[PDB]
Amino acid sequence: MIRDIIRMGDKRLLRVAPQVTNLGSAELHALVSDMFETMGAAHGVGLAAPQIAVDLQLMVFGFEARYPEAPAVPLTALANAQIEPLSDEMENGWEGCLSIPGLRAVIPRYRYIRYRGFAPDGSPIEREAEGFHARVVQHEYDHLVGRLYPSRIENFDTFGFDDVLSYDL
Amino acid sequence: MIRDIIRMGDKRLLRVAPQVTNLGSAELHALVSDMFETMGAAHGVGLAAPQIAVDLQLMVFGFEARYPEAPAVPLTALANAQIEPLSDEMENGWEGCLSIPGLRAVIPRYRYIRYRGFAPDGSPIEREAEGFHARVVQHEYDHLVGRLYPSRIENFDTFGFDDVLSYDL
Ligand SMILES: CCOC(=O)CNC(=O)c1csc(C)c1
Numbered sequence: 001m002i003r004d005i006i007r008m009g010d011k012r013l014l015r016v017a018p019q020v021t022n023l024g025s026a027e028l029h030a031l032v033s034d035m036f037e038t039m040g041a042a043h044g045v046g047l048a049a050p051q052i053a054v055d056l057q058l059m060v061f062g063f064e065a066r067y068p069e070a071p072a073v074p075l076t077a078l079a080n081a082q083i084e085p086l087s088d089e090m091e092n093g094w095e096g097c098l099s100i101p102g103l104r105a106v107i108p109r110y111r112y113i114r115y116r117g118f119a120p121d122g123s124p125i126e127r128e129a130e131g132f133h134a135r136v137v138q139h140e141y142d143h144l145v146g147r148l149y150p151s152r153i154e155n156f157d158t159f160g161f162d163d164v165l166s167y168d169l
Numbered sequence: 170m171i172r173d174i175i176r177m178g179d180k181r182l183l184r185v186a187p188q189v190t191n192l193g194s195a196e197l198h199a200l201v202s203d204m205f206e207t208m209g210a211a212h213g214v215g216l217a218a219p220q221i222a223v224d225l226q227l228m229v230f231g232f233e234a235r236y237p238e239a240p241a242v243p244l245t246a247l248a249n250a251q252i253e254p255l256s257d258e259m260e261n262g263w264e265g266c267l268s269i270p271g272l273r274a275v276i277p278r279y280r281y282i283r284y285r286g287f288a289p290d291g292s293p294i295e296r297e298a299e300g301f302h303a304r305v306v307q308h309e310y311d312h313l314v315g316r317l318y319p320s321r322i323e324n325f326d327t328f329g330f331d332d333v334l335s336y337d338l
């Protein structure tokens with residue numbers, strides 16, 4: 001089932017979500033399937049559970065094919081994500097958010113991370129990630145601690161409506 | 170004539186506008202009349218010339234009657250505005266912007282200012298202003314130096330879509 005995505009301004013996006021504790025359950029599997037369905041209908045590249053007003057440490061992300069420079073990111077559902085930078089190096093790049101429709105900004109992120117957590121069937125996931133793959137997971141992780149991209153913008157010249165911006169990163 | 174209001178992302182909002190040098194002219198008077206007409210159709214409380222893609226130090230503002238707590242602000246067209254705080258005191262309050270439709274945030278502004286400049290007929294204007302009157306003029310003045318309200322937000326919990334926010338200032 002497609003779920004409504006809540007918009008910035010909704011206090012439910014500002015919460016610190018608790019951990020997932022029903023790994024392997026039918027209920028988590030249904031939630032995850034809704035999330036992938038919801039992300040897909042919205043043409044997203046990542047979606048975090050608080051964006052459908054579900055207070056849990058859970059995100060889905062990935063796509064084959066709008067982010068032209070971005071290589072494929074495997075379709076992944078990750079519960080209880082933890083992230084650690086693997087270098088100090090920051091890289092700037094474009095982000096939008098389905099809870100902030102119409103807009104985008106340049107945001108600095110760590111270029112190189114490791115992330116760890118669990119797949120919905122309860123098996124561990126741990127991966128080193130870089131570039132857009134890494135950015136997507138850091139952006140979704142922010143949602144789980146009640147953070148959205150605008151509080152991360154450094155250059156406000158790059159923040160604007162997607163159909164109007166001509167900032168050349 | 171109603172002019173298109175350009176949206177955030179348009180580089181023309183990021184310019185430092187030059188001064189008005191045609192005080193008393195038919196051309197300025199027509200521009201000002203368009204501005205008041207444009208602001209009115211959009212139900213604004215202030216509009217700055219760069220928001221209609223006119224690179225000039227010029228703003229219109231004021232209204233009898235959406236900002237419930239706000240008393241009447243006289244209808245005013247101000248060219249070559251200069252602003253000086255009359256106290257260090259900051260006050261938080263809600264702002265939106267016609268170049269950023271759908272959104273609003275809490276923004277700190279000086280509670281008490283003086284502003285000076287010229288009416289379109291070339292006579293001097295100078296006024297002490299406080300509260301919402303003061304805020305409106307500071308917000309429009311920012312447009313003349315290529316600044317929009319998001320680069321002034323301190324509390325990102327208060328930034329969101331007008332139909333969704335339940336932040337209680
Ligand atoms: C209609 C398509 O909109 C979008 O996908 C806008 N961008 C995102 O939602 C996004 C999530 S993580 C990240 C790095 C970007």
Ligand SMILES: CCOC(=O)CNC(=O)c1csc(C)c1
Nearest residue numbers: 212213214215265266267305308
């Ligand atoms: C549709 C009505 O929208 C608005 O008026 C949104 N707020 C403004 O544009 C504004 C200009 S100065 C200031 C303090 C607020």
Ligand code: NA
Nearest residue numbers: 014015016146
């Ligand atoms: Na919070």
Ligand code: NA
Nearest residue numbers: 183184185315
């Ligand atoms: Na600028």
